[PDB]
Structures are given as structure tokens and as C-alpha cells.
Paper text:
The majority of these studies have focussed on the immunodominant response through the p17 HIV Gag-derived epitope SL9 (amino acids 77–85, sequence SLYNTVATL) (6–23). Instead, in the face of SL9-specific CTL pressure, HIV has been observed to undergo preferred mutation at positions 3, 6, and 8 in the epitope. Here we use structure and protein biophysics to deconstruct how HIV escapes from the well-studied SL9-specific 868 TCR. We add to the existing data by providing the first ever TCR–pMHC structures in this exemplar model of how HIV evades engagement by host TCRs.
To gain extra insight into the mechanism by which the 868 TCR adopted this binding mode, we also solved the structure of the unbound 868 TCR. Comparison with the 868-A2–SLYNTVATL complex structure showed that extensive structural reorganisation of the CDR3 loops was required to avoid clashes with the solvent-exposed residues in the SL9 peptide. This resulted in an induced fit, or conformational pre-equilibrium binding mode where the TCR exists in two conformations in the unbound state, with the CDR3α loop “moving” 6.9 Å and the CDR3β moving 3.2 Å between the bound and unbound TCR structures. Here, we solved the structure of the free 868 TCR, a TCR first described almost 20 years ago, and the structure of this TCR in complex with A2–SLYNTVATL. Comparison of the free and ligated TCR structures suggested an “induced fit” mechanism that involved major structural reorganisation of the antigen binding face of the TCR. The CDR3 loops made the biggest movement (almost 7 Å for CDR3α and >3 Å for CDR3β) to avoid steric clashes with the central portion of the peptide, while the CDR1 and CDR2 loops interacted mainly with MHC via a more “lock-and-key” interaction. In summary, the 868 TCR utilised an induced fit, or conformation selection, binding mode to form a pincer-like interaction around the central solvent-exposed portion of the peptide.
Residue numbers in the entry:
A (entry chain B): 1 to 242
B (entry chain A): 2 to 201
Amino acid sequence: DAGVTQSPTHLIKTRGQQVTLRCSPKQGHDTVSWYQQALGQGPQFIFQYYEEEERQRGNFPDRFSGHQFPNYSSELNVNALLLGDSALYLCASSDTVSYEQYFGPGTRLTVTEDLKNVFPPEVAVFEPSEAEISHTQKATLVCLATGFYPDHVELSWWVNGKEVHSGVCTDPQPLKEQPALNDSRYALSSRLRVSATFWQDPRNHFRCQVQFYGLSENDEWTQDRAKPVTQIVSAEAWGRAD
Amino acid sequence: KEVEQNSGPLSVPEGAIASLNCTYSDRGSQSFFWYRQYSGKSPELIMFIYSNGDKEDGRFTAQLNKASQYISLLIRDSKLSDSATYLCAVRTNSGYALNFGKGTSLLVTPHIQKPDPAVYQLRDSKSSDKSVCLFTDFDSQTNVSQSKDSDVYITDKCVLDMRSMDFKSNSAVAWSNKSDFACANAFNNSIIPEDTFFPS
């Protein structure tokens, strides 16, 4: 992209490990600023790099180090990772003449106690109730993704092979299945509402698709259960003349 | 801290004027920004301003008062798609980094034309034994309460828009794994409209 790019999309690590995050500024920008954003907070400034120098640094300890290369691209290295480092890490680029800081898409870091805390979602679709169809002439399907950790999934709906946005609402935050515990798994729901006539056509195919961000090949895995890799999990229903 | 705004959330009726404010402490601040951040995404720049007065951009107006050290964002004709966290940022002096406030969550709330509050039970398409409860078609004044019981899960309210029929509806979902659970029980924790439909 000629926009701000970052890699990787996500990282899952344990305490004490280290990470390097990468940023390329937007074409035409020469300054990069890194920020940490916790849930419910504003982005907190880590440092800014121009002409390969750290020009400003925010309230971040020495385990956050940075670098900017001659081609303007940048790295953020964090070591001796702590559980509290779990956050969205944002890169923003700017130039010396304009009023424009623009953010990249971010890298989500989870630092967890053990990779055995990582689980992919299970996904199920629940069919509209005949009571609703007869009461409203509308049909609501619910998709439920449960049991996942870390808490980043993206949920989409697909009707007869086409992604749909109309009639959809997905919870903006996953909910914690075990509120009282640090390594609680998560759930997320989404609804798709269609006319009862559309649901009542048995040729109509509805599929809830959940992208999970999990482990890769670089992660060791020696549990019995399947390695909880980055994956998509779907569920489906077909329409019915009831 | 350097940049102040309230978290909210703040609700605004669909179509009405949304107003957000931010104050800042450094009298040498020279540029001022509003960003918008939807769920799961990065902040997007929506406006910048650097001299006193108003700047208009479609339905957005930013206002800056350097003597009083505030900046405001006004949103005309508020849309459901305007629901987001809005973040103000200030740059003191030239080329510095942005200091962000904490963000204000804004919820744009539709008027429900024909409230029809109901709780329905939905079965899993893959086995009858598992199900979910759907509280739906309630008006925008109905609060949905977080569950008491730790084995019962209740989502926040969400608004869906069936765009081709210009139809909006609120819903919340609840579910549990204990059998003791019934959808009549499900949303009791919430003050529910008295006219609520409960077929099964």
C-alpha cells in the first residue's frame, strides 16, 4: 500500500520474550511516531523518529527501543515483555511541512502467561424463531463465536456466496466468558435480519465466518489438542419453508 | 493530563446535533485534531484546525478557542454510522508528536418507528439442544442490563439497519449452558417494557 503499513497484524507472546514491529510511512512522509493504545484509552505516545533520530520520547521505559532506517521505515522493539504490554501498537506517519499524522492499521500484541491459553473460536448459527416470523414478518439469525483467546476475531456474514452488510450488527466488543480471570476466553455475537420471505426460501444459504488470529508455524506446540493457529471458522444454516 | 475529554458514552438521537469538547493545558499548543475510531480499527483523521473560529467540513464543524483552550466538534444530522470513539489530539509547537485525549464514545440512537418488544428463542442449526435468546424490537429508551449470573451471558444492545427498507431495530442476545435457563428468565435483570411479547 502507498498508505501506512505495519507488520505483523498480530503477535502472541509470553512474558519475558521480545518483539519487533515494523512500520512503513505513507509515501511522501518522512517522520514516524509510535503509540500504544489499551482498550478504552487514547493512543499513548512512545517515540517519534525523523532523519533516523529519536526526536521525542514519551513515558516509556528503556525496554521500548526504536529505529528508523534511511528509507524512512521504522521498527519498534519491545523486550522483557510484561502482561501489561498487551495493546494495539500504532504507527503514524507525518511530514515536516503538513498538518497530517496518519495511523497505520496497527499490530495487536497479546502477552499471555502460557501459549496453552490460546483457543480458536467455536461458531454456531441459530435459526430465526417461527414466533418472530409470524409476529414481525422478519427473520433474525444469530451467529455466536465462543471460547476464543486472544480476543481478536473478525466476523462477517455471507448469503448465497456474497458478503452482506445490510441488516447486520455485530457486538463492538467481545465479552469475557470468565470476567474474574486474567486469561478468560471470549465470546462474540452477531445478528443478521432478513425478510421472513427470504428466510423461507430453502435455496437461501447463510454463513457466519469468523477469522481468528492465533499462533503460526513459528510457535512450538506440544499439547494434545490441535495447535490454535490463525484460522477461519464458519457455521451455516439454510432457509426453510417452515 | 495534557488533553482532557470525557469517555461518555454520550447518546445523541439520530438526526440531532452531536457536540464533543476537549480542553488542553499547554497555551503554546498550535494544532488541534479530531480523529474517529470505530471498533477494531485505527483512528482516522476527520479534521484539523489551527486558528480561532469554526471550520466546516460537510456535516462536521470544528471550533477552536485558543484563549479558553478548548476545541469542539459538532456533528450535524447525526447518523448511525457516526457512532464511534472520537479522539482529540494536540500538537504543541512544530512537527512534535500528537497528545491524544482518552476518547469519547458516541452512540447515535435511532427512533424506533413501531416498537414491538419481544424475547424469542433461536435453535442451533446444527443441534436442537443448544439455543440462544433474542430480545428485540424494543425502543431506544430500553436499557439492557448486564447479567447477574456468571453462567448467563447477555450482550449489549446493538442497532441493525435493513437499508433497502429503511428499517432499524435494536437487539440483545443472551445465552447460558445450565438447563435451569429459560428465555422468559433471561432479561429479568433489565427493566423490560411491560408490553413485551414472550411466545416461548
